[PDB]
C-alpha cells in the first residue's frame, strides 16, 4: 500500500535548524502528477500546511514561513526533506508528511507524524515505577494496576502492556509537564479482581529520544 | 490567501443525534474537503471534492455546499465519531485548514470508580514519593479531586491528567498525582483522595495509612 513515514530529531535547540525526512513507498515521486506535502500541528492547535514538492521539482511554501523553509527530493531513495531554519518555541509541533496528486489537490495518505520540541533542555530518560494492585486499588469487583512513567524529556514516550497483547481496560494518560520542567504520566489497566491471575502484567516503556527501553513487572505487594 | 472559519468550535451531542458543522471561506473555492482527526493520530480524509465519501467512511457522513459555505453532516452520531474535524481547501496556494471542530458524545451520568496507589518502595529509595489517585470510566468529564494529608488540604503539589473520551463507551478517566519529597512523605500517616462528581450523591474518599500492607 501507499505508506509514508516521518523521521527526524525529537529535540532541537532555539535558533538551530530542523531537518525532517519523509520516506515513502507504494508510489514513486518520478510518476507524473505526484506530490508530497508537509503539514504541522502545534500541541492542541489547528493543522497548518507548510510546503510541497512535485514530480517536476516545482516547490511551494506557506508565505509566512517561506524565508525559513526548503523542501527537496531524492527520487532515488524515495525521500523528501524539509529544512526549517531558526527554530523557535512556536515551531514545537507534530510534523506530518502526506501524499497529494495533480488529480486531487488534497492529501489522501498521511504518515503517522513525528513530534519535535524546540527547547534548551537536555534529553532525559524516564524512571518507571509500578502502581501495584492492592485492596486500596479495588473498587467493586474491579482491580487497578499500572506504571508511573516519571521525569523524562522531551515528548513522546510509548507504553504498552505485555508487548501490546493486553489492550482492553488500558488507560494511558497524556503526559503533563511538571513544575520541574520534566514530563510525567501514568498508564493503568483495569481488570476484575477475581480475573487478575489470568496473566502477569509487564509495562513496556519506550523513550526513543533517550534510546531508553524499560520493562516493569507489576505484581501485588506482600507483607 | 483563502482562509476558513469553522463553526461551532466544540459540539456535544447524543448518540443518534444529527450533527452539523460548517466551514466559511474568505472567497469562493471550487471544492472543500474534510478531515477527521482522532487524538494521537494523523488526520484521515473523510470527505473529498465537497460531497464524496473517502474509502471506508460510513454513509452516516455527508458533505455539501458551494462558493464559501460548506457543511459536514453526521446523520446519526456514534460513539466512534468523537474526533476533531477540519475543513481543507487545496484550490489555490497556500493550502489552508479551518480552525477545527471537536465533537464529543453526550451520554448518561456515570459515577467514577476510585482507586488509590501509595508510592512504590523503588520510588522512595530514588528520593521522591508520588501518590496516585485514579478515577475510572465516568461521565461527565467535570470532577473535583482533593488531597488530604493528615487532615490538611493540599494545594499546588498535585497534578491531573484526563483521557480523551472513550471511543466505545464515551466515558472519561482521570489521574490525580500528589508529589512530595521522601522526607515530607515519611512525616505523615493518613493520605486521602476525596472525589466529588455528579454521579455520586456525596463525595467519595479513598485513603491509606503510610507503612501498612
Author numbering:
A (entry chain H): 1 to 223
B (entry chain L): 1 to 213
What did the publication describing this PDB structure actually write?
Value of the data• These data describe the molecular packing in the atomic structure of a reference antibody Fab fragment, with implications for crystal growth and structure determination. • The structure includes the complicating features of twinning and pseudosymmetry; these are described graphically and measured. • The data provide evidence for the structural basis of the observed twinning.
The structure contains four independent but similar copies of the complete Fab fragment. Pairwise root-mean-square deviations (RMSD, over C-alpha atoms) among the four Fabs range between 0.05 nm and 0.09 nm. The first 4 listed contacts, with areas of about 20 nm2 (the PISA-provided Table uses units of Å2, so the listed area values are about 2000) are the biological light-heavy interfaces within the 4 Fab molecules designated LH, MV, AB and EF. Thus the largest contacts produce vertical columns of successive asymmetric units. These are known as periodic bond chains (PBC's). Although the calculated energies of these similar interfaces imply that contact 2 is energetically preferred, its repetition (without contact 3) distorts the PBC and produces a nonintegral, underwound helix (not shown) incompatible with a regular lattice. This provides an explanation for the observed pseudosymmetry: it weakens the PBC, but converts its helical pitch to an integer value (n = 4), thus enabling a regular lattice.
